[PDB]
Amino acid sequence: GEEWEFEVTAFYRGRQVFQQTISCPEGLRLVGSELPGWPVTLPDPGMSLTDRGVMSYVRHVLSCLGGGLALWRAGQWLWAQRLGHCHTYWAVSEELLPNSGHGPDGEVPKDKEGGVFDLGPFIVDLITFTEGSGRSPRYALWFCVGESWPQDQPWTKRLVMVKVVPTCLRALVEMARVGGASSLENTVDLHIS
């Protein structure tokens, strides 16, 4: 009931390979094979890829996930915890672009859970967006699994990138847009002759 519905979309090397929407009371765990949390198995890359070198490295990353990447809501926070051996870095960004321009927002911890999203400042920014701030609050979590965050490379090079959207936050931003809030930049310059 206090669960959140998450839309999970996985990409291997810039190709969408998986998408599932899960609303579990104990959150989810992104795993690499078949513990609390709903296990969401990231698919074998032989289903969707054909580059054998990339497939080998993706398979290696997935075999080191262990108990998985745990993600769940408790109160005002989304919490994340890394239960296996793949270092995982995260950022809040856009639906179709993992890069925010300011590197990763953090690394997912292993020994304890760590906060990755605070509903409090999201709601503050949602309210000021309805008031004319011109900036919609971001909600799409991106996880770079087994490699450093792609600062100096296109994200499509990364072996395993997972987007997780809490769908209720997506909906709240849409409600603000339907009500008349816009993020369109005042400096937009059309090139029409």
Partner: protein, 36 residues
């Protein structure tokens, strides 16, 4: 009346989660009402 502005189709789970955030944050509800 606010949920009418939820134009995208959604699951019952997403809708209840939106409603819970709205119910817990009457200042967000007020902000949505005010932009109408």
């Amino acid at each position: 009346d606010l949920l009418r502005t939820l134009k995208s189709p959604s699951s019952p789970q997403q809708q209840q989660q939106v409603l819970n955030i709205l119910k817990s944050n009457p200042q967000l509800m007020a902000a949505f009402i005010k932009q109408r």
